[PDB]
């Protein structure tokens, strides 16, 4: 997933590891650390969130007392807007036939937090869902890819993802397989992707919806996660999105919707590819590009 | 290019150029008494009189 970023957004800032370089962590200074805190940890960019048996007033009151230090100039009340990150169709292959399995990750440029399309996309990503060895589901699972994956011992695991960001995002899937099935697998996948863009049915989505629905509900299972939803909501969406809303936004999605969106973001798009391991059987950007259309 | 090369080759099969022209034939209605038929090697295929 890091390499995926590292070449998907290559050259930009998004294309960096969060843990940072080996050289940097060896030379950062009290000074440098300071600045980061100073330059970044500022109130208009921070959010105090909480959930539980607390009174709203009682909470804010505390804030007023420790998070004081009011500002003077308009400068301080400004949220530094970020430089856009360029998506670049490409691949990065790290080979080591000494590894037990190989991991591959494919992706297209995402829409960016705000976009109402992310809903449709997640509805889609639910259709293909995810699979993994232990799934008791077995050959009867509803995910076509899951099913095939099982039928032909395609992979130890795979998953769909819709990573979103302020202005952009990654959209794709990652699977782990034996050196001798990366191919078949890759192939079945890219196909399921196409299927999305071309013949998703009302049933395929009906299920997907109900799934997403309860997935989002389990995002609010306890105080910590409920909180995290608020922390992240305010900071990204700029407010709080109620399940009552999220739900309505899902009840809206139907086949036609998905087909257009996925075509909109997937169909004939140069992809970002990152492979790791004993990955010889999978071998061509072109060929992969070629798999981005018709089916 | 392809469409033309196929056309080219394909008409190579149809009729040649040495495929002659029209007819015109000689016949005496007295060489056919009352009640008979006769074959004449006409334009390729037979001709009954």
């Amino acid at each position: 997933f890091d390499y995926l970023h590292a070449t998907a957004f290559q050259g930009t800032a998004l294309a960096r590891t969060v843990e940072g370089t080996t050289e940097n962590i060896k030379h950062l200074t009290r000074a440098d650390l300071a600045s980061y805190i100073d330059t970044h940890f500022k109130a208009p960019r921070m959010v105090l969130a909480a959930a539980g048996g607390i009174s709203h007033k009682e909470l804010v009151d505390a804030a007023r007392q420790h998070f004081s230090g009011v500002s003077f100039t308009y400068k301080e009340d400004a949220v530094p807007i970020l430089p856009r990150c360029r998506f670049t169709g490409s691949e990065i292959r790290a080979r080591d036939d000494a590894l037990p399995v190989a991991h591959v990750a494919l992706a297209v440029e995402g829409p960016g937090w705000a976009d109402p399309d992310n809903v449709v996309l997640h509805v889609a990503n639910a259709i293909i869902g995810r699979y993994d060895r232990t799934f008791g589901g077995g050959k009867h699972l509803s995910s076509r890819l899951a099913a095939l994956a099982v039928e032909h011992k395609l992979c130890h695991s795979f998953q769909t993802f819709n990573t979103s960001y302020s202005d952009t995002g990654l959209f794709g899937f990652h699977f782990v397989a034996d050196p001798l099935s990366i191919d078949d697998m890759m192939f079945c996948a890219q196909g399921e992707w196409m299927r999305l863009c071309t013949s998703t049915t009302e049933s395929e989505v009906k299920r997907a919806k109900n799934h997403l629905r309860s997935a989002m509900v389990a995002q609010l299972d306890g105080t910590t996660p409920v909180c995290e939803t608020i922390g992240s909501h305010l900071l990204n969406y700029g407010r709080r999105i109620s399940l009552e809303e999220w739900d309505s936004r899902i009840s809206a999605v139907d086949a036609r919707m998905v087909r257009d969106v996925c075509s909109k973001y997937i169909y004939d798009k140069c992809p970002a590819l990152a492979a790791v391991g004993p990955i010889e059987q999978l071998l061509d950007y072109n060929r992969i590009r070629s798999g981005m259309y018709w089916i | 290019a392809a469409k033309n090369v196929v056309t080219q080759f394909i008409s190579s099969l149809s009729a040649s150029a040495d495929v002659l022209a029209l007819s015109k034939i000689e016949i005496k209605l007295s060489d056919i008494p009352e009640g008979k038929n006769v074959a004449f090697k006409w334009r390729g295929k037979p001709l009954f009189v």
Binding site: - | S14, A15, S16, K41
Partner: protein, 380 residues
């Protein structure tokens, strides 16, 4: 690496991977022999064929004479023609059982192996047709004139398609020479498709008389079937030589000893035996198109046989009903042939007509219907 040089040689491995170690039902009968014979048949026609083609001269004004010069002046030429001339028949005979064998034991459930088969038949049929015209005899001609004319039944591209065929506005030299080209080529195509035919068969193994799994007991083609076949070959070779050596002209029409005359179509006109049933059907329907169509389907129907299988069992061995119906069909065919041998007159016309109806009906309705009924009588 590999021990013996019979399993690792990218060539030798093949003759050994498809003709020696090849696993075969321990129990395939004699009706499985025709397969090889058909191959030996092909490979043999081609030899006599070249040898012949080395003396023929495709050109109306010398076609006929060249064949006679070939018979009369070429060392053993005469014999060489005979073998070719009749091999064709022996060929069609063999192919015919090879199809029946298939029908009875439902080998047709091996769809691809079968469909290729049909294409093969179609080619052979077409092949003999062109070969037959080369000698430029009276039939050759009038045959060449009637058969190609069959495409003139299609509307629009009809009359026009024919033109390519003849290479003119009526049968003439251009036709003859291009037919020689055709005839020279097709066989090879047959040999090619035969490779696909056999190659598809090898994914599934040979069917067998009992119509049930045979993995429980298989045997190497060699020497079990290589030997069974060498014998089969000699058992069929005897009659075919016996004819081509003691009665060369039995199966052949004599009218074709008279140089083609585009002006006179003979009074007693009937195609070589292997085309009679067709002939009969084409003659059964009194309509240009109907006849053609009936004809077209009289053979094209083979493609359907696989989808007209309703019995829960694979072979007829255990279905007396179907069996009787099967032999009824065979005999039905025999008649149709005979009918083709006869002129268009009563009773023949009506007899022909019936036999056709009955042919098509046994295949399209009586087999599937008896087939089902049968199952219910076993309580399935």
């Amino acid at each position: 690496m590999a021990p013996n040089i019979r399993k690792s040689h990218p060539l030798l491995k093949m003759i050994n991977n498809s003709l020696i170690d090849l696993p075969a039902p321990s129990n395939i009968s004699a009706w499985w022999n025709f397969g090889s014979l058909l191959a030996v048949c092909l490979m043999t026609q081609i030899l006599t064929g070249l040898l012949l083609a080395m003396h023929y001269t495709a050109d109306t004004s010398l076609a006929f004479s060249s064949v006679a010069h070939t018979c009369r002046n070429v060392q053993y030429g005469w014999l060489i023609r005979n073998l070719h001339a009749n091999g064709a028949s022996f060929f069609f005979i063999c192919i015919f059982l090879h199809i029946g064998r298939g029908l009875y034991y439902g080998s047709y459930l091996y769809k691809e192996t079968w469909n290729t088969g049909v294409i093969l038949l179609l080619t052979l049929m077409a092949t003999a047709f062109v070969g037959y015209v080369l000698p430029w005899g009276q039939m050759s001609f009038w045959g060449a004139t009637v058969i190609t004319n069959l495409f003139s039944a299609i509307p629009y591209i009809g009359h026009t398609l024919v033109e390519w065929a003849w290479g003119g506005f009526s049968v003439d030299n251009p036709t003859l020479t291009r037919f020689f080209a055709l005839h020279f080529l097709l066989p090879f195509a047959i040999a090619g498709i035969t490779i696909i035919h056999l190659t598809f068969l090898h994914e599934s193994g040979s069917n067998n008389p009992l119509g049930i799994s045979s993995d429980s007991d298989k045997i190497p083609f060699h020497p079990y079937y290589s030997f069974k076949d060498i014998l089969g070959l000699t058992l069929m070779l005897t009659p075919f030589l016996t004819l081509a050596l003691f009665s060369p002209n039995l199966l052949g029409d004599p009218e074709n000893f008279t140089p083609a005359n585009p002006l006179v179509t003979p009074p007693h006109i009937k195609p070589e035996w292997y085309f009679l049933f067709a002939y009969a059907i084409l003659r059964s329907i009194p309509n240009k198109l109907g006849g053609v169509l009936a004809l077209a389907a009289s053979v094209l129907i083979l493609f359907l046989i696989p989808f007209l299988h309703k019995s829960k069992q694979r072979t007829m061995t255990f279905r007396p009903l179907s069996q009787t119906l099967f032999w009824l069909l065979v005999a039905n065919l025999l008649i149709l042939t005979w009918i083709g041998s006869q002129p268009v007159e009563h009773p023949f016309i009506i007899i022909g007509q019936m036999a056709s109806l009955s042919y098509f009906t046994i295949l399209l309705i009586l087999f599937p219907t008896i087939g089902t009924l049968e199952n219910k009588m076993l309580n399935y």
